[PDB]
Amino acid sequence: DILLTQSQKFMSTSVGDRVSITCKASQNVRTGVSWYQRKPGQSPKALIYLASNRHTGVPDRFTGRGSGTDFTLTISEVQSEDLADYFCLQHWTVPYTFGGGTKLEIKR
Amino acid sequence: DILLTQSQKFMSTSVGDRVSITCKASQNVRTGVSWYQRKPGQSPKALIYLASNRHTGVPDRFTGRGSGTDFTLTISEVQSEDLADYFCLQHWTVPYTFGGGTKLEIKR
Amino acid sequence: DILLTQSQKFMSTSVGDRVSITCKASQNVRTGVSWYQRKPGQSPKALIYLASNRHTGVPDRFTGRGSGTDFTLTISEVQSEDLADYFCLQHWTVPYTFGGGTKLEIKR
Amino acid sequence: QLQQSGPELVKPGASVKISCKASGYAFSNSWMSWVKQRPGKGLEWIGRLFPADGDITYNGHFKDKAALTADKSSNTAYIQLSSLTSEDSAVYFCARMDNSEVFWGQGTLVTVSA
Amino acid sequence: QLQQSGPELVKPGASVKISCKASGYAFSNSWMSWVKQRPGKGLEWIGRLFPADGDITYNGHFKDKAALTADKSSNTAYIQLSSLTSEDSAVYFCARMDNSEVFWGQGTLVTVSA
Amino acid sequence: QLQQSGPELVKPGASVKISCKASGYAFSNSWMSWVKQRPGKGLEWIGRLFPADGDITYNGHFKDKAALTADKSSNTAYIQLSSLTSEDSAVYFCARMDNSEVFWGQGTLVTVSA
Amino acid sequence: SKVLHLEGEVNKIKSALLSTNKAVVSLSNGVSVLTSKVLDLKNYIDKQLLPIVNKQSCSISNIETVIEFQQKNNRLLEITREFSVNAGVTTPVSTYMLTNSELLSLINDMPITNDQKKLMSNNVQIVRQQSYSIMSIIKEEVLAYVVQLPLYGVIDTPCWKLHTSPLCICLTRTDRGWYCDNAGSVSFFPQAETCKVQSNRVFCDTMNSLTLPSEVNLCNVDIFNPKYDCKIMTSKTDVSSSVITSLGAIVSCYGKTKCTASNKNRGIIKTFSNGCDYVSNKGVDTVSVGNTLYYVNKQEGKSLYVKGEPIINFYDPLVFPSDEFDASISQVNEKINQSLAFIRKSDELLH
Amino acid sequence: QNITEEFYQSTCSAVSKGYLSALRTGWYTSVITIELSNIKENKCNGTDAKVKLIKQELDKYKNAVTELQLLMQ
Amino acid sequence: VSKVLHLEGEVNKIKSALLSTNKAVVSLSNGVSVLTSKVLDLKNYIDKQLLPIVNKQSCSISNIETVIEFQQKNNRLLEITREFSVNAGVTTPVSTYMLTNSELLSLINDMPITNDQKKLMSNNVQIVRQQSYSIMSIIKEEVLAYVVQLPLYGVIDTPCWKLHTSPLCICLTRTDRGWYCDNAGSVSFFPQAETCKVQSNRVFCDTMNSLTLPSEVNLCNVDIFNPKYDCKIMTSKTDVSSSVITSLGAIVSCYGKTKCTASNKNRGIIKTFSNGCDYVSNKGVDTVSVGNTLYYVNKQEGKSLYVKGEPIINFYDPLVFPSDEFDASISQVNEKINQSLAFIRKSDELLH
Amino acid sequence: QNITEEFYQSTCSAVSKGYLSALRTGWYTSVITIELSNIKENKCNGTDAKVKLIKQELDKYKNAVTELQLLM
Amino acid sequence: AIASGVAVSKVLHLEGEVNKIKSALLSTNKAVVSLSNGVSVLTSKVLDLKNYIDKQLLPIVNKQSCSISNIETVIEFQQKNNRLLEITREFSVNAGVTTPVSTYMLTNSELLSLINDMPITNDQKKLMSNNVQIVRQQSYSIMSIIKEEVLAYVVQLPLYGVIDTPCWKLHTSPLCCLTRTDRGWYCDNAGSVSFFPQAETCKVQSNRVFCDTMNSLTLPSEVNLCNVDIFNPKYDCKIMTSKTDVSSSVITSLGAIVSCYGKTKCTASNKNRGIIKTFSNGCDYVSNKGVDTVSVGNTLYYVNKQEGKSLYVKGEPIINFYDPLVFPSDEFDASISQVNEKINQSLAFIRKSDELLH
Amino acid sequence: QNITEEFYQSTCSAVSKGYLSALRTGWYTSVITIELSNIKENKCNGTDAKVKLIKQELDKYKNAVTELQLLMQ
Ligand SMILES: *[C@@H]1O[C@H](CO)[C@@H](O)[C@H](O)[C@H]1NC(C)=O
Ligand SMILES: *[C@@H]1O[C@H](CO)[C@@H](O)[C@H](O)[C@H]1NC(C)=O
Ligand SMILES: *[C@@H]1O[C@H](CO)[C@@H](O)[C@H](O)[C@H]1NC(C)=O
């Protein structure tokens, strides 16, 4: 497989903040990944498609880049409603590996 | 050649009648025949083209079918004006053989 | 090369006259020549293009024909303004050879 | 259309061609045919020809009695009927068998010159 | 869309298939997948299948525990989960990973029959 | 169009290039030429060149006297005329022989420096 | 006493020993020229056999360069030929310039979703008709060319081809072409064949299309729609028409035009009146409009065979019956050494 | 069986629907770099001093190479 | 005569002569017993260096008369492989190893179509091939099955004409160009420029791509604003100069300060033109200059060119051996063996 | 010579008539079933144990067969 | 014995050995039985070898010398006659009309001569020598006469009227909400503007296009001013009508036009910088240098072409091998010469033993 | 670099200009008359009385000649 490593598990900012999140990979996989949200007891939701595409019904303050083995997920102007769990998934060749998973918090 | 055999030479019906006439062949000739009329001292006229097609200027009560070695010429609602001689002709490969020829009559 | 021979160097006519001028060649060159004018201390001007085409801004009384090794340049209704020097040029394959050059005059 | 000539007399020691002319019709690119009739024997096929290309066929039982020619300029067919007898005395029909033209000639009443 | 069944009890000495039905959607020409989750271990990929052609894959570490089947007529997948223990007790998700459908099932709460 | 330079003096022991510039015209894809004139001898062809590709020809009787160069950037031709005498003193013409441009230069009055 | 008795036989053996040496004349000479005889045969293998065979051994060995130049290197041999004729731009991509599997790898190379990739693996033949190859660098040891493949924007939006027919004054529609569901609009294709042919799928271009609102679906009910300018061709004089579709037929029969539907096994089913009407291809195969007979179902033919039979190689090996021949040589080899018994026993007499 | 059609007597038209489609919106380009194999020239004396299959066939490949490279600018 | 002193001296002389007669066989028998080894060397040289050599090629060189003869006799299948390697199932037009000439002629005569069309299809044998198609259906190692497809025709012999339209003087221009077919109560119209094929008297077009018209559109050549038909129009007020080249002539729409000239390649300029539409024929006219644009109406001849060769001749040499007088020289030695018996038997008489 | 043309000064158009035509209204389809011939594999020992014209050329046909059947 | 007067006590000395040499001379001739017979049948042995070269070697080799010599016609017939061999093949398939012209039916240099043959200017001739590949795509070959020793066909080449008049392709897009209907190629012409309605009558090259003249439209030069005024009182042009709805985007060769409208979400992007921007309701233009991908609705577009990789198919050369012929003759023939010595030194005792006559 | 483009917000159109062109107005035709070489028929007895490479390959060219000449009327 190909292993995915995130920087950390938690966050601490203010509200309305811009947060840059990056997980990395072992090998170039040619932009075939995606990012997600997750809420407790609730289904996940796909956010950044082909590492580029914001899916339908997803707010415009949600950005992402990256091309190589390293991929930036940059979220801007956070609110109280967006406090979810967040993670990645390898999506190019089987088997499919996840990111480390990151819960977003502030002031702690 | 290919021989053609009709059922009989004469008819006997009432007027306004529907008459089914069939001549048969020895071998399948792939719908390449035609039927005719003939009047005494008068030229013949082609009726059913490619064993399917009523030619131009020919009344609508004149029908025909058949596909194999056997071909039905079905005439409906006869009148006094239509009392002619009638016959077929092999029309697919040379030489060209006729039907037996059939004169149409009623009440006899 | 291919040598070009004109008939003569000077002319003598009246005004308003039609003059037929021909230079000849040694070999058929497939209509690839042209004719010219020349004025003293002044630049030459191309007249008959591909041995057929009067160029733009050139008056309509100027004609030419020929197809083989011999090519007719026929000028009609001359005036006092047209008294120039005139010549040809081989224009088909290098090297490029001139005609003999002919100055046009009248009454002498 | 068409037009066919008048009666004829055959003769022991004669061969003769019969004229059938295309009466005002697009002619050069369609067939012709011939069929004879004797009563008590009925209709009898003769042959077929194409003009200005010269495709000629024969009823092989009849093939030696006759020969097929035509004019493409004045649009006139010919058939050289050799020396026959009264058992071949019949009425003969210039006939085209097209989807565009099912036409029939005027007949040719033929007996023996006697 | 989709719909997934209710809870389940595994058993030492049992294998059982789970039903997930395509809820009103163009189905025959797109993938399916499965992923399991255990807290303290997180999400874990299972496999993926294509219906009406039968392309079947496996997580090789998981490959012998289970087998993948489906219905193409009533649009219903199945996965025969063999005799496991409480360390595999999890909630299981029917999920498609399309650009047209990123959908997720209702979950399948699975523990041991005891 | 075109523009040609002024007079010139040749010299036993000198070679010199002459400037002719394309005066505002689509230049890079069409020929050039040269022709000399002496009175009592008339017009005399010199050669022809193409710019930005470098097709160079020669009158072989004249070929060793001169060499052909050009500028494609400032659209300026050059011809290095070596050490000649008064029998080659003439007026020289930058001239294009196109169907789009039959043009002629301003002439170049050339004698011997004396 | 017997003086003449022990001398006469001595005279007799004198010429007998003289003839013995005169026998050697018969003996030694014929074998001495037999030595010349085998040297003639030594001279015949000298020039006429051994210089002969080895010349072909390099000459006939040249063709197993020649055929094997064209045997093993065959894939390059075809791709020379198209750029001799197709002149740089080649369409569609063949199967020696792209031998199947390097489609499958280059499908899986590109950063496109699996949702399209499995579809491209499905229609392997159609995408080949939209692919292109362009020669870039071609040298004696270098053969470099550009392979070009299309990329796709939308997937699975429905479609239908139109067939217009003049309806009764008696007007006529204009617009025909393909129809694609689009984001906020309806894609429309004016040209007849930009789209490829498959039973469920079509594949068209985007720089060649028209965009339309979705209200043009309501042009099938109203003609003079305030919602949309549904297009039209004016007429007052009638014209008879019939339009053949892929899965049926439309007629616009009128007036003194005779129109007839038929079946090849049931004859005529019906005829028609003055006006538009629709028929299906399942019972209907032939339609006569005026004198123009139409076909709706395609026409069967027959089968035909071109037949052959395999061929067999044949030769014969080489052989020689050596052993009893060499045993006959061994028979003579016996004779040499048992001659020594005649030699040595006769040669005892010195002592 | 899921593809069908319909008819409109209101306009004398037709619709043959049941389809589903895709449209071209880009390109994917790449490079292929096939090489060849060949032989050496043998040093021997053969039967005929005319048959030059080693040469008069091999240059015929090189006769093609000079042709095709003159189709580029 | 001296019985002790004579009668033995020559006996001593023949004693060593008989010893030399047995010292003969040393010279005699040894050189031939090793000559026996000499021919065995030659027996050993044909043993491995000749007979194992030649028969290896006799199966090796016999392989190519499979290989060429695989490609010799089976040639018709060899071409039909390579198009479906490149044309990918759909091939157009149908080639001549895909379908040779005679099975075209039979499949024409197979179909239930009239002789009136069948003879026409035999006439234009090349054009119908350009409208024929074939699709590979089943292709296996011993199976090669493909669908041959041929067109069928509805109408025959209805007249035609191609249009060439030109702007007429405000100064408007036309709209409609294309092919025209007589039809049942109607005029068929073809908007697209090349659905129809090219032949000197005949054209062959599709029916699912055509327009239908009433026959009153022939009256559009007189009136513009016809109440009978909306003859289609392209508006302008600003003038534009145009010339349209036909197949058998040329139309000009010269106007204003545009200079327009008709010409001949052997007669020079015939004429020039005025402001307005005019027609010229191709028999005297070959070149037309419109502005600076020279047009050609008659096609331009070139020349002939030759690529020449000369046939080649095969050469070898046969095989030979001069055996007979050699074998007669063997027969000369074969004589010597049996006349040696005369030396043998007469000398061996002396036992009695 | 029967093909000609005309002209219309009324509209500045033209007509080149003299033709006669036919139009496609159907299809006629059929099936062709050509087979092949081949050889056997000889059992002999040849000169070189590398030259495999019987095999390395014959499978090249079978290399084509596996290609074309994967175009369906 | 005892023989008086005949060497009495010496008859065992004299004639006893005479009896001993009697059988010795008899065995000498009985040695010839061993001698002469084995060589007389050795004569039969070499005739067996003479009979083996008679039929089994000498008639064999020359049969292949005709039989192998056939493929040095057949391989050669497809070798130096190769230019005719391809041109057989296209008219077997392309059926009389061949396009474009190949490079065995016209091997390059006879284009260069036939360019220089025609009575057309050097101004075009140099241009035709430049684009040698495009003019080949517009040339045609038609078979005229084809026989067993005759192969004659028509080569056809285009001729050109105008040179170097400028051009541009259009890309129209819906504007608020109306849209245009007018798109095609544009050419400067004598007092006129040439227009090409069909999409691909013109060939593709970076600076040059080459179109037909019997397929074109002519326009006045005032149609350059449909770009500013819509409803031009000089001359207005055609447009299609819509009311207040359609979203669209048109891809050019060197950029992209968007007509994003309403609730359609439109986004410009970069493959290395991500999203650059999004769009509003209305027409807008973007260039291809920073922009590679554009999403309109759910439809992702590409503007820059997409790279792939390289791929290699590799081989290695092959080597011929054989073995020559050889025989060690000389010392073998010297051993024959050693036997040839034995024949002539046989004569040493021969004359010496035969001296005894006198 | 001399090819460029522009834009028109007035009509939401575009112009990609910088080009220069030529247009076909005629034809130039010619005639090519290539011939061939061949061989003779050898008169000698070979190994097999079946292999007819001199004949069964040479007529295969003549089998093509009779085909193509029947594509002309
Ligand atoms: C050809 O054979 C002769 C025979 O001796 C030899 O001398 C010569 O070198 C050979 N030539 C070649 C090219 O091998
Ligand atoms: C090759 O030749 C040797 C020679 O004895 C033989 O043993 C072997 O069987 C041969 N091999 C084949 C495959 O014929
Ligand atoms: C074949 O060989 C035999 C052998 O003698 C000969 O008689 C015959 O003429 C030969 N045939 C040919 C055609 O050379």
Numbering used by the authors:
A (entry chain K), B (entry chain Y), C (entry chain J): 115 to 222
D (entry chain X), E (entry chain I), F (entry chain G): 1 to 114
G (entry chain F): 155 to 322, 332 to 514
H (entry chain E), L (entry chain A): 26 to 98
I (entry chain D): 154 to 322, 332 to 514
J (entry chain C): 26 to 97
K (entry chain B): 147 to 322, 333 to 514
Provide the authors' original text about this structure.
Three structural proteins are found on the virus surface: the small hydrophobic (SH) protein is a pentameric ion channel; the attachment (G) glycoprotein mediates attachment of the virus particle to bronchial epithelium; and the fusion (F) glycoprotein mediates fusion of the viral envelope with the host membrane, permitting delivery of the viral genome into the cell. Human RSV F glycoprotein is initially synthesized as a single-chain 574-residue polypeptide (F0) with a molecular weight of ~70 kD. The double cleavage results in the removal of the intervening 27-residue peptide (p27 peptide), generating the N-terminal F2 fragment (~20 kD) and the larger C-terminal F1 fragment (~48 kD) that are covalently linked through two disulfide bonds. Accompanying the virus infection cycle, the F glycoprotein undergoes significant unidirectional rearrangement from the pre-fusion conformation to a stable post-fusion conformation, facilitating fusion of the viral envelope with the host membrane.
